[PDB]
Amino acid sequence: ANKTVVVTTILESPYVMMKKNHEMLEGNERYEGYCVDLAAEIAKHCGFKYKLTIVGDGKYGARDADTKIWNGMVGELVYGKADIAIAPLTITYVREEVIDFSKPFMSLGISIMIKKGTPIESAEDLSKQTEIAYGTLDSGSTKEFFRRSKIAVFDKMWTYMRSAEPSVFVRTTAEGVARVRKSKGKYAYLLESTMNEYIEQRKPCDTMKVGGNLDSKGYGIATPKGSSLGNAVNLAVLKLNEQGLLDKLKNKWWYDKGECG
Numbered sequence: 001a002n003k004t005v006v007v008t009t010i011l012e013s014p015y016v017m018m019k020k021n022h023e024m025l026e027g028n029e030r031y032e033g034y035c036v037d038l039a040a041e042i043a044k045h046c047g048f049k050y051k052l053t054i055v056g057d058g059k060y061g062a063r064d065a066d067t068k069i070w071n072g073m074v075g076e077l078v079y080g081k082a083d084i085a086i087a088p089l090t091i092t093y094v095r096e097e098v099i100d101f102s103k104p105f106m107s108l109g110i111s112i113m114i115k116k117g118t119p120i121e122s123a124e125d126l127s128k129q130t131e132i133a134y135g136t137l138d139s140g141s142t143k144e145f146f147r148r149s150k151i152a153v154f155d156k157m158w159t160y161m162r163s164a165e166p167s168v169f170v171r172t173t174a175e176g177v178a179r180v181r182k183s184k185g186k187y188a189y190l191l192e193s194t195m196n197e198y199i200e201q202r203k204p205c206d207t208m209k210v211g212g213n214l215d216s217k218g219y220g221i222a223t224p225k226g227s228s229l230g231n232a233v234n235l236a237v238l239k240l241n242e243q244g245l246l247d248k249l250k251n252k253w254w255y256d257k258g259e260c261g
């Protein structure tokens, strides 16, 4: 019998945000954003009803060292708390081993965020100096990228980050943005290009993306391994993309409402 599909996502603008009069609303009505629109498109196409719920620990998802327990949205799927994850969750090897991913609905890569004027234009620049600190988001693909990389420049950046004091790692993207904006150029943030270019179009328009991306990957709609939803969700993403819906949604939340020109 038909049952409401539990969707796990995360409060990360502009993917999922609280609507202005959210205190008055209930259920899915409380939220708005790219993934809120995407979730509606996928549901309509796959013919199911859903319930959006913000991940409890507010994390994307990593396997805890020692306990070996997955947290974040990935954990929700692994331990059976949610039927599907619709958010800017990166497709990775270690995640693909425990959960399923549809083909990408958005392409991206790790990038460098700086406060305008900062004397840095590449990862190599960051790795060769010590005056400007830099870090990443915790519990996700970005931190794991530097921890696993065998590439010289990235390995050197990891070696420095992992033992920096005070910590250069943040719990949420907003925490990293605020750290860049209030550090007078003494902090650079490593985050995915999607998020970097989004913040580049927001007041006070004081941040900027420098250099090219360090890698190339994508976000995928995830489901518990072997879930019956997988096939239809994948086809839905491919169709939505071919119809131009996805390009339309990104303009809607990124550029249409741009605040810096």
Ligand SMILES: Cc1onc(O)c1C[C@H](N)C(=O)O
Binding pocket: 012, 060, 061, 088, 089, 090, 137, 139, 140, 141, 142, 143, 173, 190, 191, 192, 195
């Ligand atoms: C969004 C976002 O932007 N930079 C990042 O590290 C992230 C999280 C990343 N998508 C993950 O799955 O861990």
